[PDB]
Ligand SMILES: CC(C)[C@H]1Cc2cc(F)ccc2S(=O)(=O)N(C[C@@H](O)[C@H](Cc2ccccc2)NC(=O)O[C@H]2CCOC2)C1
Ligand SMILES: [Cl-]
Ligand SMILES: [Cl-]
C-alpha cells in the first residue's frame with residue numbers, strides 16, 4: 075500500500091496470535107511494544123527517545139505480521155506509550171519513504 | 174526520491190537561516206528542533222515521547238526547506254535529542270510510506 079501522513083500511520087499487527095494497533099515509525103530504529111508475554115529468553119536494552127529513556131526486554135526472532143506482511147525479528151517489550159514498528163521490521167516488509 | 178530504511182532517514186533542512194540535519198519521522202505528529210532562534214510569537218507546549226515529556230516553544234507559520242521542497246507549518250523548539258521532521262511537514266512535501 076501507499077500510506078499518506080495526514081493521520082498517524084496506524085496499522086494492525088499480529089503477535090502471539092493477538093491483534094494490536096501499532097505505529098509505522100521511520101524515526102524509531104527498533105520495534106517496541108507494550109507489555110505482553112513473549113517466548114524465550116530476553117536480553118536487556120535501553121531505548122532513548124524524546125523525554126528520556128525506558129528499559130526494555132529484547133526478544134529475538136519473534137514472528138510478527140504487520141498489515142498482513144510476515145516478519146521475523148527483534149521485538150522490544152516495555153513501557154512505551156504506543157506500539158511502535160521501527161526500521162528493523164519496516165525494512166523486512168520492504169517499506170520506503172517517497173516524495 | 175525513494176528513501177530506504179536501512180539507516181536513519183536523515184536529511185538536510187533549511188530553517189531560520191540555518192542548515193540542520195533532521196530525521197524524517199512518520200511516528201512524530203509534530204516537528205521538533207534543537208534550541209535555535211526563530212522569529213515571531215511562540216507559546217509553551219509539552220510533548221510526549223517514549224521517555225516522558227519535554228517542554229518546547231511552539232512557533233507557527235515557519236518556512237522550512239526539506240530536499241528542495243518548501244513547506245510551512247508549526248515548528249517546536251526545545252531539548253530534543255535529534256531534530257525531527259514530523260507529519261505536519263511530511264504531508265506538505267508529499268511524503269508517503271510505501272510497501
Ligand atoms: C507517539 C510517539 C510514537 C512519538 C511521540 C512524538 C510526538 C511528536 F509530535 C513529536 C515527537 C515525538 S517523539 O520523538 O517522542 N517520537 C517519535 C519517534 O520516532 C522517536 C524519534 C526520536 C529518535 C531519537 C531520539 C529521540 C526521538 N523515536 C523513538 O522514540 O525511537 C525509539 C523507539 C523505538 O526505537 C527507538 C514518539
Ligand atoms: Cl530484527
Ligand atoms: Cl502545522
Ligand SMILES: [Cl-]
Nearest residue numbers: 078079264267
Ligand atoms: Cl496527499
